[model samples]
Target: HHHMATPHNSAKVGDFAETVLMCGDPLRAKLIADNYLENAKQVNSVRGMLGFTGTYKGKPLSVMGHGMGIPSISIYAEELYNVYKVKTIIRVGTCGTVDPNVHVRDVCIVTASGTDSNVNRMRLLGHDFPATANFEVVSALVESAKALNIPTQVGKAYSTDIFYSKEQGLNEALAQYHFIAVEMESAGLFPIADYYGARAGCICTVSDHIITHESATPEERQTSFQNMIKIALEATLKL
Candidate 1:
């Protein structure tokens, strides 16, 4: 085995699990680690991007914070796969719904992602990149939710780098194209996973409905996000 390290993380070899559950917020990562993983211990604190390794259902797993946006997640994920040799990464986060059929707290299983970010285009010779989830991980996510009777949509999502932009026309256009949710990271996740040969997918709870303009509070998001985390953790076992 080769010793590996990254400037962004302090984890030594074997500190990370082959399978990982990722959150956009470091605090959320801590929440999952403390509440779900038995015997969990912090394995990384570099840049305050906390990571923990432990067992869920007696199977080794790791949870870490990826921070927000395409750039942030892209850096973290690429290092985890390339430097740490993690085999699978499941992004467990929240999204804003563009589809009326999908509601608050509904889990959106990202089958494919369309990104407004230039990350993929810059890499794929300026062509539109067809970023998508690993098929097996997608199937497992859907199956796990189904078995638990949780609402889910196996569909496309749009990952935009802009969160504070006032772009109504952009939202309308994306909604017209049947994008299920608007999130910030999956566009980066899929491509990194592909480049490194690591399986990857994203499970997002619908925290807002762009169609109806309805939304959830921070407390509601915390509660609803747990279900997304649960589905991701359960689905990881199937991999």
Candidate 2:
């Protein structure tokens, strides 16, 4: 009587670990599995959204691609939480920094997310929902980064619906509101995780700086991603 598989995910029960690290890019998920996990196996490949479960440091772990935007991530996260009974989901991805202090190649641990998306509001019956990360997960990530000697900025992020936003002074506005970075999915993921009583956290490497027009090349960005992945994996061990 278990709904073992969803349309988007073909994995059966127990295919996923309690803690999952997700990125927006499926290839990045592959890279993490190939490079970091031991005895990794592909568990889901529906719609080319790849998912793998393996062990890291002899501990159960999972990696998956949530795709782009709020809706896409929300769908996958909801299934993982509700159907798969995942306890925690940590988003490891790239973000664009709005704050000048948050430069390219910097890692950011998103404590809270402010969004232009209405998904959370709808979930709350039009009331404001505080999209926030899990404290234990956040602490674990911070400790992991510290143990690895990677300096990270822990702050709030703004998740916008539009990647190419047309609003003038948007970067400045976000910065003024003390948002360190901007990304697409955390806002949706946080609330959904909250709804399911599951934990969620986000750690992003700054790939671009909006105001300074500074950015990392693909090669540099890949290295940055790896560092964030390492942090996420190390943090997972503690959870």
Candidate 3:
């Protein structure tokens, strides 16, 4: 018997491509499909976590929403990598920066992730598991962003479990250690991708600067989001 659906996703095996551009929001996935993909089709809409498949520049591509945070992303990432035989999944999302120089609308290519999530620690038996990006994917993203003339910074990010936390000291320490931005998924995404012998990378737009209290307006965010998606798509072609 063929399994046509999982608990969370309704995508069949043949409905997805081997490479995917993932984001934390379903609407963003729809936007990428609408704007970048040719003849895009919805493959999964179960639980409102959408998935789409189509061609971008004549290459087969897929886009899907991972929802928010590590747990949400882990479920979708696992399914994509294990069930669909997906090879690469790049997370395109927004982040808040701790570095003063990284302002709103700037691009951050995340090379590594430091997390407050316990999943990695639990897996590694209390030691820190350094969740890192695939080198080729990171390089491809950098080259693509440069070609697009988008300003980008490559750095490590903190993936935290608590979005609203009283962890001022933790933030300061992470900032002191040169972690550039804070987001929810990559810390978990990279690990799960690795577990399944798949490759992954993350590119984030700076939606705000936590230290400086600078933020992008909705209009600015929209533009930056589009650029981030382009970088992801362009890099996917390289991979």
Candidate 4:
């Protein structure tokens, strides 16, 4: 009779909107709440992993920080889906481009994710799981970007457990397999959402070129992802 909160999130039932937009940084979640969502309210601040719920274009929406890596995001995703009953989760975050064709500041709508992490496999009875986004959410993200005149690449990403990998040729291998972006969370998010029968999607702005070693300034990385955020918000309206 008292399952109102999880170990991480303290938001009560229905505190989260049906559709949630997530980022890796809690500060980014606060930024979205302050600048984008109208009449926003802080829904959760447990352990300073901030979450907010508000209206965008007069429709209810929520924004939260899922933290870094597969394990971190998986905890939030599972609770959001199972406890709060969130129907859709869209990870609007930043990624690094593995493919030379994907340039910095370009937005990528992830179709599927391949991971070195075994979390998905563990969920799938020790077999490789196809961690894929929801078709409806992916379509909406693409269409919204098109409508806003924001160019986007729809492709697959590789999620890595080790951010600073010592493994040689990892980037080459990922690119060889046609992964456009390299990120840390989507592989975990997709499968967890699937397990709970909730929809999940990811759209990331390229903050760096892994091959070229070009990266956005720290300030730019924090604030210059407005285009991706706008596209995500517009897509939320459609959902």
Residue 239's lDDT in candidate 3:
93
Quantify all predictions' global Cα lDDT against the true fold.
Answer: 0.88, 0.93, 0.90, 0.91
Global CA lDDT computed for model 3: 0.90
TM-score of each: 0.95, 0.97, 0.96, 0.95
* Candidate 1: residue pairs that collide: none
The clash numbers for all candidates, in the given order, read 0, 0, 0, 0
* Alpha-carbon deviation at 154 in model 4, angstroms: 0.8
Best by lDDT: 2
* Per-residue accuracy of model 3 over 1-239 as CA lDDT, tens digit each: 33556788878877899999999889879988998999799999888888899999999999999998999999899989888889999999999988766778889999999987898988788998999999999999999999999889999988998899786588688777888879999999999988998899999999988887888999999999888888888998999
lDDT of 1 by residue, 5-61 (tens): 877888897889999999898988999998999979998887889999999999999
Q: List the residue pairs that clash in candidate 2.
A: none
- Residue 155 deviation, candidate 1, in Å? 0.7
Report the error of model 1 at residue 99, Å: 1.2
Flag regions of model 2 displaced more than 4 Å. Answer: 1-4
Q: Candidate 4 local accuracy as lDDT? A: 0.91
lDDT of 3 at 139: 99
Q: How many angstroms is residue 105 displaced in model 1 relative to the true structure, after the best TM-score fit?
A: 1.4
Off by over 4 Å in 3: 1-4
